[PDB]
Structure 1
Amino acid sequence: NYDIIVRHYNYTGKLNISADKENSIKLTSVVFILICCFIILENIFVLLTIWKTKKFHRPMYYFIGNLALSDLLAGVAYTANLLLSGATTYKLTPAQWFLREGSMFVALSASVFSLLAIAIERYITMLKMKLHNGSNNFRLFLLISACWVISLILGGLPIMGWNCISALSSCSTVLPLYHKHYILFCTTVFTLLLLSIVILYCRIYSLVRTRSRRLTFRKNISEKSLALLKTVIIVLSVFIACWAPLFILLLLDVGCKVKTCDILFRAEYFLVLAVLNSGTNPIIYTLTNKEMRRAFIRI
């Protein structure tokens, strides 16, 4: 119980014989809790804005609300994890220690799955042209349920299997009591999702360009393609440029051995950068659209 946790931390070396007083006295903690409070604020304004207007009820807006809810849950998960990080080498049972990380993983996977669902829906809608645009609730419900179930399963898998409590040689250093196979599986899932999103957006842009430029040869006196390219490059640049550090850190963790690399004790900055990226989704997803910003100006 307690002995297993302290033994694992001593083997990793993160115990540090903490003798600090109960007071937080950490500037990083306060700046990060203010940052996540700001994230929660932006998310809650987005949720109220999309809830109030009756016009905003299309499935696109349902997916946007799903993403906003996932980000809202992620911010609360981050602040809860941060407020409990002080007493991590003592006063804790393994059950709560696993629960914190499971909630963290669920919160950080739900947003990625929501982005994947949004990209899939946009590609499906843009693939075929219809005079009046609609959508069947079956596909919406299927996606909005499957994403949550798969995220919950991925988060809750370590609580029983791949718990590393027996083996003393396969436990990671950034997160003790964790088998590295789970980290490898998670990073493979992440890179697969990234590839799928990039391919889908590239296909959407290529389809729009090919259908527009070649078919139409009217008189002269193409801004749609430029605007589409700008939006695509903005979203992709943000997503990769602010999810890369955690990817690199996880690969470095699975690569290094115990007592071999003295860099991994800096994961807080990469984690807060990833949470900041997850938080700054609504800015991108409401600034580009004319109607959403007009409604926000009205509100």
Structure 2
Amino acid sequence: SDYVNYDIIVRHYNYTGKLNISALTSVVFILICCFIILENIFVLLTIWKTKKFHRPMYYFIGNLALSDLLAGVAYTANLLLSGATTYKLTPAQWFLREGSMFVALSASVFSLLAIAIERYITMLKNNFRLFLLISACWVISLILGGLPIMGWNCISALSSCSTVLPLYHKHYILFCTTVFTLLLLSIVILYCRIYSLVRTRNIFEMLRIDEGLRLKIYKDTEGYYTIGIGHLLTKSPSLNAAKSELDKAIGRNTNGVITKDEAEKLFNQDVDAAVRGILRNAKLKPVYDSLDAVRRAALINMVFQMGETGVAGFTNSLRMLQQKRWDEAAVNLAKSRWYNQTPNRAKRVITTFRTGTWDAYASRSSENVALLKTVIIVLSVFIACWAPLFILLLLDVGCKVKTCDILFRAEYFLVLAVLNSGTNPIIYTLTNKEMRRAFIRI
């Protein structure tokens, strides 16, 4: 008879040992999955109902919700076709009962990839090609999840059958575990790169306004010759004396004309010197250690104009920054000589000490900053729900039948990965209130 008969299921659930060992709890999860259906319906309903959410990143966030929406479906069917009903299924129906979970996982992982790569392009800066990436994602998912249905299983190799999945081959689970963890590794390494490089990029754009970029040697309001983002070359009133310093600070004979990178690489040096000038002063270091990344960079901007002693000459305001009473600090500095010399320059710096956000230099630099935080947490919860399963799966690959006993009760791990599908809609309305105000708007 066809190797699509009900005896193979009995035979394979016999060799593992979950045939005689069999146990109300289901109808509870069946109902919990219906909550995961709605939770992700509103995610796909609000992104379709909000004009500001018709942005490329939100389409990948929605595809992720569609993956976790079909996961909630595929698992309601799993609960209805598990336990006693497992044996009223053909091997094909079985590979279709579990294959739908792997397709829902594969799609979810590449959705996180598509969201992580749609972050790296915000700093380093296209609508049809997106519903081409989303189409590619599900085709690649069906191919990986369908491999056991297409033959890569163990229907004759009982010795090679997985304990947690009796018809799946240990080589298939070893492959999936490896591919998806390598992708999840690459995504973690990508967000850290995006987080730290934007931390530098924000400082590069802040002073690109307050000091102003230049490729040809100019003179400041005081008189002395300057280049790029406020880099003083010499106090000397000779242009060739300034060209001497520039052709030595860059190396090549620039003749006063430098490059975009040569300006940026010369800029970081004045950032390094400004940062070191804070880490060598007892009135600046505690202030810097107490400030957040936005206000840490805001202090570096004041030091990039006056200096160590120049910014130290504001102790009455620095003390207020240590006590976290930004409001009084913003007033004292507005009344001091610094807010009068360069008024619009200080105005932006003081607004950053008051707010604590870049909503003084660039419009979309708070909402994008809030998304980066939330978007990473979505991955942080994902990698925390699947890692216990992926480890047990990786144990089973190296386990012999009826040897490892933790495998015979893997359901604790399996449902953690299922409940992960309902954590993402909740994580949006809590951490990113930009999204939360659009949901409550329905």
**TM-score, normalisation: structure 1:** 0.83
- The more displaced of 50-59 and 31-40 is 50-59
What is the distance in 1 between the residues matched to 2:395 and 2:402? Answer: 13
CA distance in 2, matches of 1:18, 1:268: 13
With 86-95 and 6-15 compared, the bigger mean Cα shift is at 86-95
- Given the superposition, is the C-alpha separation of residues 297 and 229 from structure 1 closer, same or farther in structure 2, using an over 3 Å criterion? closer
Contact kept? 1:111, 1:278, Cα under 8 Å: no
CA drift at 1:223:
8.9
Contact 1:6-1:89 at 8 Å conserved across structures: no
Are the structure 2 counterparts of residues 256 and 17 from structure 1 closer, same or farther at C-alpha, using a change threshold of 3 Å?
A: closer
- Paired with 1:236 and 1:12, the residues of 2 have a C-alpha distance of 33
The two structures, once aligned, show a CA RMSD in angstroms of: 3.4
CA separation of 1:298 and 1:229: change in aligned 2, threshold 3 A: closer
8 Å CA contact 1:15–1:89 kept in 2: the answer is no
Of the structure 1 ranges 9-18 and 175-184, higher mean CA displacement relative to structure 2 is found in 9-18
Q: Distance in 1 between matches of 2:185 and 2:403?
A: 32
Deviation string for 1:243-294 (max 9, x for gaps)?
Answer: 2111111111112111211111122221111111122112223433343222
SS of aligned partner of 1:256:
coil
Q: 1:291 to 1:225 in 2, by over 3 A?
A: closer
Greater mean deviation of Cα atoms: 63-72 or 177-186: 63-72
The alignment partner of 1:161 has SS state of: coil
1:217 matched to 2:353: yes
1:78-135 deviations in Å (ceiling 9; x for gaps): 10111111334532211111111111211122111111111111112233xxxxxxx9
Q: CA deviation at 1:182?
A: 0.5
The answer to whether the 8 A contact 2:385-2:417 is kept is yes
Q: Distance in 2 between matches of 1:270 and 1:49?
A: 31
Q: Please say if 1:255 is aligned against 2:398.
A: yes
Q: For the structure 1 residues 209 and 232, does the alpha-carbon distance in structure 2 shift closer, same or farther, using more than 3 Å as the test?
A: farther
Report the Cα offset of residue 296 of structure 1: 2.1
Measure the CA separation in 2 of the matches of 1:273 and 1:141: 30
Give the 3 Å change call, closer, same or farther, for CA 141–227 of structure 1 in structure 2.
closer
Q: Distance in 2 between matches of 1:232 and 1:292?
A: 12
Q: 1:12·1:258 contact (CA, 8 Å) conserved in 2?
A: yes
Report which stretch shifted further, 67-76 or 84-93: 84-93
Q: Which residue of 1 aligns with 2:18?
A: 14
* Partner SS for 1:260: coil
1:177 Cα deviation after fit: 1.8
Residue number among 141, 147, 158 corresponding to 1:168 in the alignment: 158
1:54 to 1:217, Cα distance in 2 relative to 1, 3 A: closer
* TM-score, scaled to structure 2: 0.58
CA change 1:6–1:144 in 2 (3 A) is same
Give the stretch that moved more between structures: 7-16 or 181-190. 7-16
Aligned-partner SS, 2:160: coil
Q: Residues 428 and 436 of structure 2 are in contact (CA less than 8 Å); yes or no, is this contact kept in structure 1?
A: no
Deviations 1:35-67 (A, max 9, x none): 211111211122222222334311122122211
C-alpha change, 1:10 and 1:217, in structure 2 (3 Å) is closer
Equivalent pair of 2:71/2:104 in contact (CA under 8 Å) = yes
State the Cα distance separating 1:232 from its structure 2 match: 6.7
- Render the CA deviation track for 1:119-177: whole Å, top value 9, x for unaligned: 111112233xxxxxxx9124413321221111110111111222211122111111112
Partner Cα distance (2:390, 2:158) in 1: 25
Aligned residue pairs total: 281
Q: How far does the alpha carbon of each residue in 1:189-215 deviate from its partner, in whole angstroms, 9 at most, with x for none?
A: 11111111101101110111119999x
Do the aligned partners of 1:50 and 1:61 also contact (CA within 8 Å) in 2? yes
Gaps of 5+ in 2: 201-344, 355-364
Distance (Å, rounded) in 2 between the aligned partners of 1:295 and 1:145: 27
Shift of 1:13: 1.5
Quote the Cα distance in structure 1 between the aligned partners of 2:381 and 2:346: 27
Contact 2:69 2:421 in 1 (8 A): no
CA contact (8 A) 1:246 1:270 kept: yes
Q: Is the 8 A contact 1:110 1:151 kept in 2?
A: yes
Instruction: Give distance in 1, aligned partners of 2:346 and 2:178.
Output: 36
| Preserved contact between residue 378 and residue 424 of structure 2 (Cα < 8 Å) | no
Map 1:6-85 to 2 at 5 A: 6-16=10-20, 27-85=24-82
CA contact (8 A) 2:64 2:111 kept: yes
Alpha-carbon shift at residue 231 of structure 1 (Å): 4.2
Return closer, same or farther for 1:102/1:225 CA change in 2, 3 Å cut-off: closer
CA contact (8 A) 1:208 1:225 kept: no
Residue 24 of structure 1 corresponds to: none
SS at structure 1 position matched to 2:406: coil
Structure 2 vs 1, CA of residues 230 and 70 (structure 1 numbering), >3 Å: closer, same or farther? closer
Question: Larger relative CO (CA 8 A, sep 6+): 1 or 2?
Answer: 1
Query: Structure 1 residues 230 and 213, CA, compared in 2 at 3 Å: closer, same or farther?
Result: farther
Decide whether the 8 Å contact of 1:286 with 1:292 is kept in 2: yes
Deviation at 1:233, TM superposition (A): 6.2
Counterpart CA distance in 1 for 2:99 and 2:19 is: 21
